[PDB]
Design a protein around this ligand. Structure first.
Ligand SMILES: CS(=O)(=O)Nc1ccccc1-c1cccc2c1[nH]c1ccccc12
Length: 189
């Protein structure tokens, strides 16, 4: 509990494995996964974020999303309300129907976009919480490698003025993700 796991990429971006649940995020940006209808109470990650943030998070998302055509890969920005961050980036994650290989590529593009948004806002840190393998057809270890590799890729190919830290937020009882990230971090250190 007392430590975060740490891995810095060759390009200088620090990744932290944080085992505190998703409600305690203390980064500038937190990324949420939302449905196409923008209802924040459906999936378990979003429901958890909503429970801490308060219903104002839903109020603001509904307002920013009104009359916006929303599809897979849409990213909408709100303030954080009672979360301990500055902004939430609400993303419509892909599902398996988008195609197997396609869906991994789409997740990579989403990860990259959210980091680019954070840098464009002159912010320092972004958190990606575990969303689960909800409606995606790959095991958690595939997604752990994917996100870490994308952080490596992004930071090697870009000079970053402000973005310094990427936090992976895991619930301490998420045994499968804790094992996947721990193995990846151990392997790369
Ligand atoms: C698929 S997962 O959420 O179980 N894997 C992770 C476990 C812990 C922290 C981050 C991720 C993760 C991996 C790949 C893409 C995303 C992840 N979290 C996100 C949250 C929002 C949007 C994309 C992502």
């Amino acid at each position: 509990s007392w430590e975060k796991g740490s891995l810095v990429s060759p390009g200088g971006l620090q990744m932290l494995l944080v085992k505190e649940g998703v409600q305690n995020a203390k980064t500038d940006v937190v990324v949420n996964s939302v449905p196409l209808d923008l209802v924040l109470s459906r999936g378990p990650l979003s429901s958890s974020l909503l429970e801490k943030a308060g219903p104002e998070l839903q109020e603001e998302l509904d307002t920013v999303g009104q009359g916006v055509a929303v599809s897979m890969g849409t990213v909408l920005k709100t303030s954080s309300w009672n979360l301990d961050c500055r902004y939430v980036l609400h993303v419509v994650a892909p599902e398996w129907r988008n195609g197997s290989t396609s869906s991994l590529k789409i997740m990579e593009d989403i990860i990259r976009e959210c980091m680019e948004i954070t840098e464009s806002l002159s912010l320092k840190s972004i958190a990606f919480p575990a969303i689960g393998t909800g409606n995606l057809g790959f095991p958690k270890n595939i997604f752990a490698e994917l996100i870490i590799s994308e952080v490596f890729s992004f930071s090697s190919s870009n000079q970053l003025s402000t973005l310094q830290e990427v936090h992976f937020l895991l619930h301490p009882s998420d045994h499968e993700n804790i094992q996947a990230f721990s193995d990846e971090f151990a392997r790369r250190a």
